[PDB]
Amino acid sequence: FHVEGLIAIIVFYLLILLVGIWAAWRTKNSGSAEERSEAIIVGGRDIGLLVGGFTMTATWVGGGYINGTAEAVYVPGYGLAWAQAPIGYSLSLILGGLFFAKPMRSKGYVTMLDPFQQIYGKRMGGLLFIPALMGEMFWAAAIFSALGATISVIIDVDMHISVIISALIATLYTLVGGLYSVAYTDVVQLFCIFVGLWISVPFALSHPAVADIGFTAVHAKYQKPWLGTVDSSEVYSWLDSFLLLMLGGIPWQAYFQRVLSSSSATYAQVLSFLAAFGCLVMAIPAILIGAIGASTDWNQTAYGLPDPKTTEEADMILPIVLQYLCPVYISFFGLGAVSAAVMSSADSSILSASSMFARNIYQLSFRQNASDKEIVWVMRITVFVFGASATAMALLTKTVYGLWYLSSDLVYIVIFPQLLCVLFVKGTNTYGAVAGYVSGLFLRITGGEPYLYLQPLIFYPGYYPDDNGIYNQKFPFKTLAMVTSFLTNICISYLAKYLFESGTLPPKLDVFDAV
């Protein structure tokens, strides 16, 4: 059982819990006494540059970002060219810092939905809250499932117990404390994941069993080369994936909660670049470990004859190299690193979802008149209930990954064009917003779901048949949908504004405010 590993894990958990408790103690004079909700939600709009950069780049890298890259590098047929997580995340952060998040700090805003609830109606603000909430919960569930799998592989510990303990730790953090506590925990977690991941590269590379990883990047050894060039017949799919990972990670409440906490705007502008650099630095060891796993031969290690690819467990290729190609005291460090990244991403996501709901649904839509104590108690109970819901989804269900992918898709397709319209273009009244949202949502769900083999419905050129024969798509409908939403929103909003201006349609049926 290696009781030393369990003791180290529990004392590390207690140490980060003590850090969170100290942060909660420190967070007692943030602002005056009648803005407790706003204070706990946005940290009092006062953090340092380094602390913000560290907490944000710890938020983005959360274990799934490591495992997906490692698996994509390792699994034959994907290669390195199909592991678009590093470049996608880095360029998404760079684009966000360049274009967005400067106006967000320019105005006095609390969450992502505040501009939306200000421009459109309260109904529209409550309606756009569903996709982002679903995406954040699904992401947290997937991250928790990945952590459970890693724990179960590393030590003979039940997945349920590990995920329950880690999630309870996350709720005990983000319930007793808010943004301050979560950022102070993420600062330590960043260093934990760095010292864990970057220290296991020389250990694995110098293994006698492993071959020359440079020879396999252009030649074949035990399998197809791990570089993985993309064929010309699938360039559209690669561009679609790049666009999704480039423009679908920017309209996330985790990003906007951290930008709307710096004392100024240039602080957040350079925070984005620091986060991108940290994301690249974190992605490098994952790529290296994936390459090591791809360019090594089993039947000489403690694993045995059947490779991970045949046994269909390549989703956890990282904690398999970290276990069978490194000593025990390096394996425990890497497990701690993965757990710390998972905890950081999970707590950040759950706090962002709670911050979105317990304000933009409760005090601006349902109870416009409520005491600060009531709202803070709603805050504290909402963090717990949403964490419990994410835990139940992660533990009692097995289709979490595909649902998470679909939820991220939906978040991108819905929020990003609407965020672009509300932040950059003028006009963009709710009359066109409803039509754009409906069109994008229905076009995406009719675009085809190939993971859960649910329904292809509308056929697009390419007609790719999977194992079940369900027709898969090739056209970039995942981004055609976003562009369709953008143009239809602009056109319909301007048409409504022009028709109202000319008086051709009677103002009697003006349901919303566009006169």
Ligand X SMILES: CCCCCCCCCCCCCCCC
Ligand Y SMILES: *[C@@H]1O[C@H](CO)[C@@H](O[C@@H]2O[C@H](CO)[C@@H](O[C@@H]3O[C@H](CO)[C@@H](O)[C@H](O)[C@@H]3O)[C@H](O)[C@H]2NC(C)=O)[C@H](O)[C@H]1NC(C)=O
Nearer to ligand HC6 (CB atom), residue 185 or residue 241: 241
The sign of the torsion formed by the CA atoms of 466, 472, 476, 480 equals negative
Position 326 contacts ligand AV0 (CB under 6 A): yes
Distance CA(92)–CA(69), nearest Å, equals: 16
150 binds, among ligand Y01, ligand Y, ligand HC6, none (CB under 5 to 8 A by kind): none
- Give strand pairing partners of 471: 465
User: DSSP letter at 278?
Assistant: H
513 binds, among ligand AV0, ligand Y, a second copy, none (CB under 5 to 8 A by kind): none
Helix (H) or strand (E) holding 387: helix 372-396
Distance CA(132)–CA(145), nearest Å, equals: 20
CA distances from 356 to 23, 69, 120, 306 (A): 22, 30, 17, 47
Nearest residue to 174 via CA among 354, 310, 307, 341: 354
Smallest separation (angstroms) from ligand AV0 to the CB of 328: 7
Distance CA(260)–CA(257), nearest Å, equals: 5
Position 214 contacts a second copy (CB under 8 A): yes
Smallest separation (angstroms) from ligand AV0 to the CB of 512: 53
Of these, 199, 211, 265, 480, which contacts ligand AV0 (CB under 6 A)?
Answer: 199
49 binds, among ligand AV0, ligand HC6, a second copy, none (CB under 5 to 8 A by kind): a second copy
Position 408 contacts ligand HC6 (CB under 6 A): yes
Position 300 contacts ligand AV0 (CB under 6 A): no
Distance CA(449)–CA(464), nearest Å, equals: 12
User: What number of residues does the chain have?
Assistant: 515
Position 212 contacts a second copy (CB under 8 A): yes
Q: Which pair of tokens denotes residue 30?
A: 């943030």
299 binds, among ligand Y01, ligand HC6, ligand Y, none (CB under 5 to 8 A by kind): ligand Y
218 binds, among ligand HC6, ligand Y, ligand Y01, none (CB under 5 to 8 A by kind): ligand Y01
Position 424 contacts ligand AV0 (CB under 6 A): no
Position 218 contacts ligand AV0 (CB under 6 A): yes
Smallest separation (angstroms) from a second copy to the CB of 274: 8
86 binds, among ligand X, ligand Y, ligand Y01, none (CB under 5 to 8 A by kind): ligand Y01
Nearer to ligand HC6 (CB atom), residue 204 or residue 342: 342
211 binds, among a second copy, ligand X, ligand AV0, none (CB under 5 to 8 A by kind): none
- Looking at residue 388, its amino acid is A
Position 287 contacts ligand HC6 (CB under 6 A): no
Distance CA(459)–CA(448), nearest Å, equals: 8
Position 399 contacts ligand Y (CB under 6 A): no
Position 299 contacts ligand Y (CB under 6 A): yes
Per-residue exposure over 220-236, b if at least 16 CB sit within 10 Å of its own CB, e if not: ebebebbebeeeeeeeb
Q: Which pair of tokens denotes residue 450?
A: 């190939």
Of these, 287, 351, 406, 423, which contacts ligand AV0 (CB under 6 A)?
Answer: 287
Binding mask 258-297 for a second copy (x = CB under 8 A): ------------x---x-----------------------
Q: What is the CA radius of gyration of the chain?
A: 24
Site for ligand X, rule CB under 6 A: 198, 201-202, 205-206, 212-214, 288
68 binds, among ligand HC6, ligand X, ligand Y01, none (CB under 5 to 8 A by kind): ligand HC6
Stretch that binds ligand AV0, among 18-26, 204-212, 340-348, 394-402 (CB under 6 A): 204-212
Distance CA(437)–CA(433), nearest Å, equals: 6
Cite the DSSP H helix spans in 27-158: 36-42, 49-60, 64-74, 85-99, 102-106, 113-119, 122-127, 129-154
Nearest residue to 151 via CA among 346, 9, 282, 41: 9
Site for ligand Y01, rule CB under 6 A: 80, 86-87, 217-218, 283, 287
Of these, 54, 116, 173, 203, which contacts ligand AV0 (CB under 6 A)?
Answer: 203
Interaxial angle between packed helices 129-154 and 372-396, expressed in degrees from 0 to 180 and rounded to the nearest 10: 50
Distance CA(127)–CA(120), nearest Å, equals: 11
Distance CA(149)–CA(318), nearest Å, equals: 11
Nearer to a second copy (CB atom), residue 126 or residue 196: 196
198 binds, among a second copy, ligand X, ligand Y01, none (CB under 5 to 8 A by kind): ligand X
Nearer to a second copy (CB atom), residue 90 or residue 237: 90
Nearer to ligand AV0 (CB atom), residue 206 or residue 266: 206
270 binds, among ligand X, ligand HC6, ligand Y01, none (CB under 5 to 8 A by kind): none
Size of the site for ligand HC6 (CB under 6 A): 9
Position 49 contacts a second copy (CB under 8 A): yes
Query: What are the backbone dihedrals phi and psi of residue 465, each rounded to the nearest 5 degrees, phi first?
Result: -90, 125
Nearest residue to 288 via CA among 199, 370, 362: 199
Which pairs count as long-range contacts for 389-393, CB under 8 Å and 24+ apart, including other chains?
A: 389/137, 390/137, 390/140, 390/141, 390/144, 390/167, 390/346, 390/350, 391/141, 391/144, 391/163, 391/164, 391/167, 393/137, 393/138, 393/141
Smallest separation (angstroms) from ligand X to the CB of 207: 9
Catalog residues that contact a second copy under the rule CB under 8 A. Answer: 48-50, 202, 206, 212, 214, 270, 274
Catalog residues that contact ligand HC6 under the rule CB under 6 A. Answer: 68, 139, 241, 245, 248-249, 252, 405, 408
Catalog residues that contact ligand AV0 under the rule CB under 6 A. Answer: 199, 202-203, 206-208, 212-215, 217-218, 284, 287-288, 326-327
